[PDB]
Amino acid sequence: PNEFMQFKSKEVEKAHPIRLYTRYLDRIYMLFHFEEDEGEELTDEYLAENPDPNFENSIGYNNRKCWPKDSRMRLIRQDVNLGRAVFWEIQSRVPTSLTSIKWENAFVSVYSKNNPNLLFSMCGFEVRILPRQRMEEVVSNDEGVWDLVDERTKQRTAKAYLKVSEEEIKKFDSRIRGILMASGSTTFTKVAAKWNTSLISLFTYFREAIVATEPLLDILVKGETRIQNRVKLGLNSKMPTRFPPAVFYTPKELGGLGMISASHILIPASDLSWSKQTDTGITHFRAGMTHEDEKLIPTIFRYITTWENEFLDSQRVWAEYATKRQEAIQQNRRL
């Protein structure tokens, strides 16, 4: 059998439109690589089937609302039609009595001449893949970007910018809320422990992808301050001077709480009205979780190996292991 998304040949891979596919847990991810002819056919069959005089169907389209206007899927009459057509085709393919494949719960991204970015969510990420050839100027690859490598040439052929999905952010927020409530009985240490757990989950799961999402940053600051106020409220104090970061971020060994800052971060707050249209370079830094007598509390994000690094690294070390295993075999020893 094939390895994950390998093919016995190139020809076989190229034969069909449906170049890749994966059903992560009741959420399919069909990748189609159409030609102009095929696309034309699809649009034809669909459009003829389901006509519309104007563009019209551009509204009621499931775009990626987290990304910015010129970043997410542009609304070309053609490409959009293709997308919708594709979705229709897929719906036709599965019987309705078996399951509900409603357009409303379906994001269709498109890559083309007129659409340079290629979007999706998976495992609660949002991933904007953008190939190097289509980028106007390849800047210093930022953080929260995966440079993807072509297997043949071994060059960084494409980038994949990463946001955290709104859904995941919401889930996180809910978690924080849960922690907060049912804590009148609960003691400060326990509260902080729970919060610590929550934060480490949130990062260690999607590490690198936190850089991008400003809403997540906001939640982290807001949430963290709420937690702090749980302690500060608990002492009926709730006051800045008398809870210097000693009490919170110092560990449980030293009478502290062990709270793990994902807070004293400077929140990148770019021009909100422009940022909606296009991605900006971060220009203005807002002060997130501030304090009087500001001792620069280190974050947690710096002390977790960001995923891309972890994965390249993984590839290296596993390769090394493989090589040494061969050595062991040759030498006839226990490695």
């Binding site: 439109p17 085709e89 036709s92 393919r93 599965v94 019987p95």
Partner: peptide, 30 residues
Amino acid sequence: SWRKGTAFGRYINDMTKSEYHQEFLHKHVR
């Protein structure tokens, strides 16, 4: 050619039975 090879190639006044209601439940359960 490729689209042939599939298996399938080509108001109510009840608050518990409103389209809005069922939809809402679907949304807020998982």
